[PDB]
Every structure is written in C-alpha cells, then in structure tokens.
Amino acid sequence: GSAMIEARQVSELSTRIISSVQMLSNAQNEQERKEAGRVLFEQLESLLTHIKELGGESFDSKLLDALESNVQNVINNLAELGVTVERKLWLAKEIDTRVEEMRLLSEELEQLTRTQVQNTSTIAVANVTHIYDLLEANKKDQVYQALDALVEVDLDLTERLHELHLLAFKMLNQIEEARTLTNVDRIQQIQTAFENNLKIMKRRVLAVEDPTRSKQMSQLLTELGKRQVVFTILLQQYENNEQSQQLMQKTLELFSELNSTVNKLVDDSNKTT
Amino acid sequence: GSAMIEARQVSELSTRIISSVQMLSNAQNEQERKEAGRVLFEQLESLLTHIKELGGESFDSKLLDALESNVQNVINNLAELGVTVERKLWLAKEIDTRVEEMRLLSEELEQLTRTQVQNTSTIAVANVTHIYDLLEANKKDQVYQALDALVEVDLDLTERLHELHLLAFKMLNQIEEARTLTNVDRIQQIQTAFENNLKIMKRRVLAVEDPTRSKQMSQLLTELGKRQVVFTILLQQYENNEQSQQLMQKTLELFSELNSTVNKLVDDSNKTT
Amino acid sequence: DEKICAIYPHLKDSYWLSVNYGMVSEAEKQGVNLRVLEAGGYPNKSRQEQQLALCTQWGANAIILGTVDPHAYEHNLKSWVGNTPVFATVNQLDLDEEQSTLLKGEVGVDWYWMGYEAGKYLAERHPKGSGKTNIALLLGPRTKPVTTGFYEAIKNSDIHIVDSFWADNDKELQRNLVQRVIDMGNIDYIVGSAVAIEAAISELRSADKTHDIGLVSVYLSHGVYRGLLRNKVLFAPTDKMVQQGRLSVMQAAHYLRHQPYEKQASPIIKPLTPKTLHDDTIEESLSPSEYRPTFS
Amino acid sequence: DEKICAIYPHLKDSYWLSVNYGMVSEAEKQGVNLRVLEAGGYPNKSRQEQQLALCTQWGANAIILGTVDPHAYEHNLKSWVGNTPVFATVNQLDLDEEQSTLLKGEVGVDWYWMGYEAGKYLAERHPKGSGKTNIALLLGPRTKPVTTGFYEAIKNSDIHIVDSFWADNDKELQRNLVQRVIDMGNIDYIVGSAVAIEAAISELRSADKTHDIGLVSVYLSHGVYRGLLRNKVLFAPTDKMVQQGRLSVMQAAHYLRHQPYEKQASPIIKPLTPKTLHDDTIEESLSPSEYRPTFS
C-alpha cells in the first residue's frame, strides 16, 4: 500500500548515494572529504528512516531480516570506504614529507661528491705546477716520480670520483621521481634499483681515502638507507587506491542486494489488504 | 498498473550498467574493452525495451519527452565514455612506442659520451708516458710544453667531458621516468627540463673539437629534439584519464535523473484507471 | 687546546682550498683545535645555519665565519651561536649592534681594489693617446666592488670595454662566454674571474688565438698562477688567501688566550705578472702542491 | 679509392684505440677510403647489425668486422651486408658454409697463448719445489682461452691459485676485487686483465703494498705499458694490436686490388718485461702518444 511511497524513496535515494561515494573517492584535500561525505552522511540518515518506515510494513520474519542485514552492510561498506579516503589523504601527505627529507639528504651527498671532483681537479693543476719547478732545477729523478704520482693518483682519482659523483647523481634522480610515482611496477623497480645503487655506493666511499669526507658520505648513506621505507609506503599508496575502488564496486552490489529485498517487501505488503 | 513491474526492471538494469561501465574504464588490453564493452551493449538493449514499455504506460506529453531525453543522455554518455576508453589504450600504445624510440637514442648518446670520457683517459696516460721519454733524453724544453698540453688540454677536456656526460646521463633518466608519467605537474616539469637540457647540450657538443663525434651527437640530439612531442601526448594521456573520470561521474548523475523520471511516470499511471 | 670552529660558504674553489690551508696550518702552529665545516655552496643559506648551530653543540670556544650572505645572521647569530665569539673571514659579515656583541675580529680584503689593480695594469699598458684598445669583461654572476673598482682604474686611458657578459662562476658557463668573445674577434683582452680566465687559457689554445687575446685575471687561483708562471696570463692580483686564513685563526687564538691582535686584519693586495712571482707572496696566497682539504 | 668500412665492438678500450690507429694509419698508406663504426659495446648486438647494413648502404667495397659475438651473423651476414667481401678482425667470426662465402680474410691471435705466455713467465721464475708461491686471478668476465692457457703453463709449477675473482672488465668493478685481494694478504702476485692490473698499480700504491704483490697482466695497454716502463708491472704479453689493424686493412685492400696476401694473418705474440720493451715491438702494439680516435 503506502509501502510504495517509502520504497520509491529508498530506490531513489540509493542512486543519489552511489553518486555520493564516487564524489567521496575523487575527494582530495580534507575539504572535499568533510563535504562530499558530510552530504553522504545525510543522504544516509534519510535512507535509514525511510528504511525504518518500510521496516514496519511487513512481518515476514525472513524478509525483515534480509532488510536489516542489507542495510548494515551498506553502512559498513560506506563506513569502510570513508576510512580508505581518510587514509589516502594521509598517505599522500606522508609520502611528500618523507620524500622531501631524502631530497635534502641525497642533494647534500651529490653536492659533496661534486665538491671532491672539484677539489681533485684543482689539486691536479697544483701538482703539475710543482713539476715545472723540479723540471727546471734539473731534479730529474723527482720530476718523473711526480709524473708517476700524477698518473697513479691524480688521474686515477679523477676518474674514480667522476664515477662516485655520477652514482650519487643517479640516486638523487631516483628520489625526485619517487614522490609523483604511482605505477606499481615502476615503484618496484626504483625500489630495488635504489637499494642496490646504495649498497654499491656504500663500499665505493668506504674505499675512497679522505677521512672527513668518507665519514660524512657514510653517515649520509646510512641515513638515506633508513628513509628507504618511503618505497614501502609508496606501495601502501597504490594499494590503498585499489581498495577504494573495490569498495566502490562493492557499494553497487550491496545497494542492488538491498533494493531487491525492499521490493519483495513492497509486495507481500499488498497481500491481504 | 503494470508500470512498477517494468520500472523494477529499469532501476535494476541501471545498477548493472553502472557496474559494467566502471568495468569498462578499468579495461586495458582490447579484451577487457571488447568484453566488458560487449556485455554493456546487451544490458543497454534490455534497458531500452523496458524503457520503451513505460512509453506506453503514460500519455503526459511533458513526462514523455523528459524520459526520451534522459535515455538519450545515458546512451550518449555511455557512448562518449566508450570512445574515451579506446582512446586511452591508443595513447598507452603510442607513448610506449614513441618513448622506447627515444630511450634507444638517448642511450646511444650516453654511451657515445662515455666512450669519449674513456678515450680521453687513456690518451692522457699515453701523453704522460711520452713525457718520460722526453724528460730522460734531456729535451727539457719539450717537457714543460707537454706539461702545458697536459693541463691546458688533457685535464681540461677530462672535466669538460665529465660534464657533457653527466648532461647526457640526466637526459636519459628523464626519458626512463617519462614512459610511466601520469602527474600533470611533473610531466610539464620534466618536459621543460628536457627541453632546456637539449638546448644547453646542443651547444656544448658543437664546442667539443672532434669532427666525427661532434657530428654524431648533434644528429643524435636533433633526433631527440623531434621526438619531444611525446610529452605533449603524455599530457593528452592525462587529459583523457580526467575525462573518463568526469564521464563516469556524469553517468551516475544521469542514471539518477532517469530513475526520478521513470518514477514520476509510475504515477500519472495511477490517475484515471 | 681551545676549540675553534670554521664555517665556509663552500670549499670547491682554488680560493677557499687556500683559505683552508691557512687555517689548518695556523691552527696547528697556534696549538688550537680546529674543526671546519662548509655549507653546500652560496645558496645553502639553511645548511650554514644548521652548521652554525652545530658548531655550538660541539662546544666551540670561538667561531670563524665565512657568510653565505652578508645580511644573514644580521639579526640572528646569537640565535644560532648563542653568544660564542665570532670572527668574520674573507666575506663581509654585517650585523646590527645587538648582534655585533659577538664580532671579535674581521679578516678580508675590499674587493674594489682587486678590480682596481687589474684595471690599473691595463690603464698603464695603454695610456691615453697610445691607441684605442678593446676589452671584454667576464667578471661573473649578475655595482659589485670588483666592477666599480675596475671602472675607476680604467677611467681615462684609451682602454675601451667592447662588451661585458655575466653568468655564474661555473667553469662550463664561463667557457661558453669566452667562446662567444672569441667569435666576435675585435677584442684584445679578456678581463675576468679566475675561473673564466682559466677557461680562456684552454679556449684560446684550441682556437689558436694565443698571442691574439691577452688575459687579465681579477683574482688568483692555482691555474691562473700556473698561467702567469707559464706566460699564458698577463696579470692578476692577490689577496693572499692563505694569509687571510692564518689571520682569522690567529685572531681567534689570541682573543681567547688574551693576547694582542688586529681587530680588523687585511693583507696587502699584491700585483702579479709572469716576471714577478715572488715566492713569499704566493706562499701567502695558494695552498701547497700536495695539500688536500683538511677539516681538523 | 676503394671504400673499406670497418666495424668495431666498441672503441673505449686502450686496445681498440690501437687497432684503430693501425687501420687508419695503414688505410692511408694503402690509399683506401676508410670509414669506421663502433657499436656501443659487446651487449649492443642489434646496434652492430644496423651498422653492418649502414656500411652496405654507404656502398663499401669491403667490410672489416670485429664481431660483438662469435655466433651472430653466423646464419645472417649476407642478410645485412648482402654479399660485400667481409674480413674478420681481432675477434673470431664463425659462420656456416652458406655464409662463409664472404669471408675473404682473418686477422687475430689465439688468446690461449696470451694467457700461456703470462703463465710461462711465473712458472719459470717459480719452478716446482723451489718454494710455494700464491697467486690471485682477476681475468674478468664469467673455460675461456686466456684461462685455460694460463692454467697449462702453470700446470705443475709450485704456483698456487689462492682464489679467482670474475667481474666485467670495468675499472671500478675490478678495483673492488683488487682491493678484496689486498685484504686476504697471502697473495704474492695478481695475474689479470689490463684494466685489473692498471687498477692494482694505483690500489697497491695507496696501501703501500708495492713490493709485496707483483703484477702480471694478461694483455697490453697504455697504462700497463707505462707500468712496465716504470717498473710497476712485472710482465705483459702483446698480440700487437696496431699491427692486427694494419693487417686487416692490408688484406681488404689487396683482395680488391687482386693482389697476394695471407688469408689468415696472425701477428706473433711478444712477451714484455720492464727491461725488454723494444721500440719496434710496442710500435706495432699501442697507438702513438697523441693519436685520437679517427673514423675516416
């Protein structure tokens, strides 16, 4: 009888809800959340009271239960979806903060290796200038002992650091690309590439003899090594978005399940008038 | 009368449609597309026959045109969304193809500049080996003369090439990160970064006095210069994923508008029996 | 052993490698405990702040500071170092009176005379009425003491500045301009930063224009020195970096040991030409042929 | 002028820089039109393939080719070069009877003898029961002629191989190993690739372990040579890189000019110690102290 007036309120509000959950996922800033969802709250309250009225339009034990259960599942689903959204907003905020932290660390390590390539070079010129003196004071035996040092040390070191710097430069780019990363496979790749790249670099510095520096690069490296978890949470990111999508596809199956029941409930409410 | 029976068909099939379209957005392989795109068609035909039935359950000119319109929009909407999905797969294919092309060029450039770095290295060691012969043949003047070429030419070129190589290495990483770019902000960032890098390098190579090499690199760089549109299409890719999302949201709002009308239609179907 | 902490803007330059040798060397003769830190480079304003604070946490008795900017710490300093005695080095460190409480010493050279000396050499090689001579300026980033000083010495003297390019003091950027100057070929000299002149030495050789364009450096560095020594550079002044380095340490050492000391030290600039490279003068400028940057 | 197109695996090596000098030099005396191309390195199998075709497009009357892998082109060749006369250089180029139609000549040394020569050197200086002597092998990648040959000259000789590390022939990779070796300090000699020995020279100096470990290279290179010259390397065998280069250009030249020539030329390996560096012998091996890679 009057159950139509109520089930037309349910069927109609269900649609408007499905549209509100989509709006909630596409939220992203804490405003769109405490809004596209706050309107959802209301659209839900209304669904519940109209579902409450439709609830007293029958006494079939079986059907009166499916309804109760269907409604709870819709609420539990929306509720969980909202958690997914608060979590998604938090993860983004987190990743940014931890990444910018490594940018600063990696950037210093890059600038540090560059400082050494820079020093090594001017020192090479100093070393050659000195040969001019020996050479023109006929200190022959020392002239080509300095030449030996020029090759065995300065020239060798020059190439050695170019490599070290090139390696620290690579690491820095992995971190710059790191934030905006969203592709699960690329995140996997950079993740193991970074770890690997870091393991090899930890040795190369421990080798380079230059007390002060080597020590600093090691501290910078272990510190970056720690901040590495940013990749794990970069996955929680991707993962959490796979969830908000599955929940969405679920909302539909539930609202379907519900209306299928609110219909059997309008009928057999028209039996024995 | 028998209106409700058919509207139950509509409100129901609607939900199934919304589920098939979301399933069509998440498509990506021409299988999921043609597949989830096929089922969509059928669910739509069903929705049409039932929608056509209501057309005979009322004669209110006004309400009848509203329904006509709502159905056309849902149809046009799904249609437009179907086009967005195939455009999506095309872009993916185009980007992957155009990007790998560049990776191969950028990679040759990098190797070519590394080759030079190594040649310069060995040449240096050769140049110093020669100073020994001079120094121990007391050709004192040719010694610090070779030493001048050592500083003014070899060491200088060593740093010059180290830099040129760094530059090419950077450019390679930009391309590697490019193929999986999806963030409009970073895409534009990398885009303009790549462009300056290309400009600044095109000049540096021309400086490097080495006929063959200086020509290869230039051709390589102009080649990479052309392939640069990839960023533009990387942006079209972004713009497209934005649509498919707004359309998907439009779909929900359109199916809601439809139901509200098929309901105003179940009434005016109870007036004058 | 008193603890002295030195903070530089960077340490990639031939210049600061030399200022370093000064401190590390003096610090050892003076019997102090030197510990040096270097900001990333002039733009790392924040890194230097952390380092200033870091020196304090180390418990430094005195701080030798080479500002990453003049007006930074102008209203802070006590906020970073607390109230540790601070001595300025190489660079101008101005800070209000409430802050100046910490300034116990200054060392450095007015870079106006650095540029003035360079110009004076050219002004005298080409007097008024000897023949219009075309110059090209490659002084660096971006006024600026060096420039105005050069301009004053050039004042009245047949020397004409054809053009003046600017760019960061990066070897590769400077090389770019030198190459540009060479191509417009109506230049007789390139007055510029040590780094630019260094580039010009190599670039003038690969283009066979040695003999064509003369090089005048606005300051010293191994490389520029090596150029004078080998007749590839005509002139360059010195502000004795190594000495500026020693002085700052001596100032700090004495102030703490309660001894006399020039509150405002400033070595006497000296002009250098290939034929006048007095040992004592360069020993006070560039670091030794084997010295590697030392931090303690 | 006949157009001869030479294709290398790469040209970053001290070795191939020499092969190149040999070709460019010879090609010029021979009066031909040389044109060299180098793949990006051994893994660039596909780049070389396109280069093979690019030689063809250019209209080469002959192709000197140093394979990026023995078996590639083994069932192709004609598929890339059509049927241009091809001559193998340095590396072994095996190919089926249907393809060997083009194989007009070959130049190269069996690396078995290179490893053996280095083995003979140590064996003779450390005969059986004259005293156990420990060695460490840093030969490179991954069997292999070099290895098997060194093992045969060491066979029965009181020379014991403590360990044998392998890595690509990259400087930094090898230095790691050389370092690992200096740690387990039991080794008396390090036999290895040129790059490994070159590393060892520097790595031993900084550890002060010169005199402790002797260095024996398996092949020649500037650097290793400069090492022998200055008594830092004990021995090194030469497969005369430069000459192999001349030989291939010679072959290709003659084959076209319808002249005589050995279809299978192989220079004679010469051992090298600091006291036996004969001018003519190293002339036929390394590129001159000024030669820069030339591609025409």
From TrEMBL, chains A, B:
Coiled coil region boundaries: 64-115
Organism this protein belongs to: Vibrio parahaemolyticus serotype O3:K6 (strain RIMD 2210633)
Compartmental location: Cell membrane
Protein name: histidine kinase
Domain of life (superkingdom): Bacteria
Residues of the full protein shown: 51 to 321 of 988
TrEMBL record, chains C, D:
Annotated Pfam families: Peripla_BP_1
Broad class of where this protein is predominantly found: other
Keyword Signal set for record: yes
One GO CC annotation: cell envelope
Domain Periplasmic binding protein/LacI sugar binding residue range list: 2-256
Localization of this protein: Cell envelope
Record has Cell cycle as a keyword: no
Keywords of the record: Signal
Disulfide bonds: C5-C55
CDD domains: PBP1_TorT-like
Annotated family: Belongs to the bacterial solute-binding protein 2 family.
PANTHER family: D-ALLOSE-BINDING PERIPLASMIC PROTEIN-RELATED
Record's protein name: Periplasmic protein TorT
Species per Swiss-Prot/TrEMBL record: Vibrio parahaemolyticus serotype O3:K6 (strain RIMD 2210633)
Organismal lineage: Bacteria, Pseudomonadati, Pseudomonadota, Gammaproteobacteria, Vibrionales
